[PDB]
Design a protein around this ligand. Structure first.
Ligand SMILES: O=S([O-])[O-]
Ligand SMILES: O=S([O-])[O-]
Ligand SMILES: O=S([O-])[O-]
Lengths: 219, 220, 220, 222
């Protein structure tokens, strides 16, 4: 009842990768029921960012995800009060990130409080060298663990030069209100895209498409 | 003289050791390469009854059985008639680790599979030695090139009795026998594996699996 | 030239968040860098009482307090006057993951510590959220250079109630503030960290640590 | 609690079968050791699959924790498992995806320990240190011993020194199990080791291997 077909979103991410502090302001629109959202982002300090913007992109709301009827939608059922997610990103070269987002809503807008942190990215690695092109599309596996909805994902960044950079992520989602029903095992296909940006990535426009499904042969 | 025919046969021998238990499993079955479907009947010839869950073996009993669409290169069907081999490592969240290998070849309408499977470090209280597993959930394997070889990464979950999952992380490497097989670009493979039937000790099992490659969203 | 005195003060502020719970922890201590020893009294200024095992934070409260033999380069004694930073990941066997960083500087007789600590994904019924930890066991860190930076790898174990162990994989990267301080070759550190005393809610903690460097067998 | 019959100068017989990246091999070895001094060594000869297309170094830890100096205050699980013996299973995970599985069955007849080892390795990259044979030595390290899921378990983060002097990381988990009943389980401890190829021929077809291990309690107890 609370979510509408078209909603706004405000976002304030703050973080540190490799000792580098940054703030990023975001403002955007999207269709929760179509699994879509875009948003305009602007680094407000920390720019020029010394690292690849790509590592940030998954960390700027699953509520924007096309859920089919045979699958419980934890995220759209979390609102008004909202929900929180925490995430770790484990890169194949030792680079490790942790993140959190408190997602809230009032009126037509979703509010996202997001903290990002990253450690141990190697000097001549693709992240500090900015050799990343984009996230390749993948599929997140959703399941319950310790009484909590958990998502594991097998993720890859395309690099300059016809090779890929592995990332492995675990997310833990918690609805704020008591009583929200945990879903069964499902899978969530997603694509993420930087549609436009300036040369140093101080201002970027980002797009996310997400759809949930029960996998083969039901997808 | 096309190598891949619409209805083909599968001949399999697996020999292995998990936690120091030796075993031999012979397989016979069939499948439809272009539809990405296969089924086979397995018979434990040595080492029955198996002390561990049969489920840990079932990915190791052929990606030639995957429905590839036009716009994605099919390494597997292009690997024939000479064939290919794969190597896989399976890392479970409780420390059990398996490695396996299959050299697969082809004569006429039949694929031959010479498979080896080794496991160690499964705890006695774990869902594997307790034979507490139910099925592999559906999952998506990521295909991409690493050091000039086709590589596949997958995070799979084994559903357990009692409404719980058991995580396995798997990496496989596929190498065509013949020189000059064109490697595919990055893509996804969806799959499902289902034990369709089994006798009480799992000495005789009917297995079925379906694989479909694709390019992820938006495209389907 | 190092300007490390044989008795030094230690001043520290830690700020952070584990599983959404934000805490601030102030420390005051002293140490003897040349025999590898330091102890500090902590008190949590924000976030008391902490909902999680205090022992996970304990690693994060300076390898100058390590005993280095003459035959091994002491990167940490040599990073001063200017100081140094370290970054560190802590991956626990049940999916809990922490990152931490410290910027260490020296003003006279006192080392100053800016520490941030963030922890994610601890399961509600794991040893951390239920406070079933007893101590870190004594272990050994592997120091070596990777990509131009002193790196320390170690697998640690936190003793649990009943004498079970909880396993933590840690990686730290240490960076001298000033350019062209020299790189040690492969060596080992031994460490022990012991919580000496604490009140009921671990809001006042008194922590001791001992660390010595060596080159391993047969030298030792 | 029980006379080991381990006599302070003992022999070692060993047969190994393996496969790494699809290459089959058999290595034999005869050796000697001093179990109470935690020192041992062996002459190995590659009997099949020679010359090996991979770094010999990956195999060297698979060729017995009986040869480890245990001080009185730490339970020695290995010498107490004799005369009957014991077995281990081990997984080796390298930072670039190389994964290995190894197991050994140790028995004792009279003066001689007998080892049946299996070793299998998978997914070593073509231009990695292993396949390109660019390893030099294992650095000294320290394994942590503790009971896990009821079984004596050894964890260790090792590193192979490589040509060009970078290191190549490997993470090992070993499980040890006595053949007979009644063997006491140690408390947590540490075991230092150092392994060294003493001498070898061009193709690593004949190799001389030595190791030294001593168990201890960490700090500041050592
Ligand atoms: O290039 S695709 O991700 O639109
Ligand atoms: O894999 S299907 O048959 O569940
Ligand atoms: O003599 S020892 O260093 O192998």
């Amino acid at each position: 009842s609370a979510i509408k077909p078209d909603m706004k979103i405000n976002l304030r991410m703050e973080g540190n990768v490799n000792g580098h502090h940054f703030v990023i302001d975001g403002d955007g629109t999207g269709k929760p029921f179509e699994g879509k959202q875009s948003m305009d982002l602007e680094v407000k300090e920390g720019g020029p960012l010394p690292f690849a913007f790509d590592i940030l992109t998954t960390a700027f709301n699953r509520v924007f995800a096309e859920y089919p009827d045979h699958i419980q939608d934890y995220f759209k059922q979390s609102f008004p009060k909202g929900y929180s997610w925490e995430r770790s990103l484990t890169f194949e070269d030792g680079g490790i990130c942790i993140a959190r987002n408190d997602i809230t809503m009032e009126g037509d807008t979703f509010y996202n409080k997001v903290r990002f942190h990253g450690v141990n990215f190697p000097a001549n690695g693709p992240v500090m060298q900015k050799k990343t092109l984009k996230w390749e599309p993948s599929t997140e596996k959703m399941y319950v663990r310790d009484g909590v909805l958990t998502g594991d994902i097998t993720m890859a960044l395309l690099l300059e030069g016809n090779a890929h950079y592995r990332c492995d992520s675990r997310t833990t989602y918690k609805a704020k209100e008591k009583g929200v029903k945990l879903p069964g095992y499902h899978l969530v296909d997603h694509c993420i895209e930087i549609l436009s940006h300036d040369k140093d990535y101080n201002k970027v426009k980002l797009y996310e498409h997400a759809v949930a499904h029960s996998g083969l042969p039901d997808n």
